[PDB]
């Protein structure tokens, strides 16, 4: 048993809810929250911007030190950093950004990072301002992640369409 509530069962291991990922983290304090990161860990807007704002910019300060030491992530890659006030850990995962011309086949590689963690609170990778089709992102998630993933979908309209169209 875990602390996630009202989540709507999609598969053996994948659950979904209409919730802003920032809000949900504050309530649950999950072991792992996933950030929709870019390779520079520049959390300007989007989930990264909303998560970072909720940490009072401490996520960005920690991320700038990580990049100064290690250099940029790979598209499809990840790093584990602090979860600050939101979670124990934040798994920063880089899905391909369609609005930058990145290979959508890298979305599967991105979701493979989730398999290193038994339970995660996550957004749909490459959705929102990353430009991919969220229906596609949910299909890759279900077909790639084997650990237990709790997806939050910010848009009530999109949350309804993802459920209704789910095969
Ligand atoms: O939370 C989201 N995940 C993936 N796509 C979207 C989400 O919120 C949105 C709001 C407007 C348009 C797309 C999205």
Swiss-Prot record:
It is found in: Host endoplasmic reticulum membrane. It comes from the Viruses. Inhibited in vitro by GRL-0617. It is a multi-pass membrane protein. Residues 1-167 form the Macro domain. Changing residue 164 to L: In strain: Gamma/P.1. Signal peptide: none annotated. It catalyses: Thiol-dependent hydrolysis of ester, thioester, amide, peptide and isopeptide bonds formed by the C-terminal Gly of ubiquitin (a 76-residue protein attached to proteins as an intracellular targeting signal). May form homohexamers. Interacts with N protein. Responsible for the cleavages located at the N-terminus of the replicase polyprotein. Participates together with nsp4 in the assembly of virally-induced cytoplasmic double-membrane vesicles necessary for viral replication. Antagonizes innate immune induction of type I interferon by blocking the phosphorylation, dimerization and subsequent nuclear translocation of host IRF3. Also prevents host NF-kappa-B signaling. In addition, PL-PRO possesses a deubiquitinating/deISGylating activity and processes both 'Lys-48'- and 'Lys-63'-linked polyubiquitin chains from cellular substrates. This is Papain-like protease nsp3. It comes from Severe acute respiratory syndrome coronavirus 2. The lineage of its organism: Viruses, Riboviria, Orthornavirae, Pisuviricota, Pisoniviricetes.
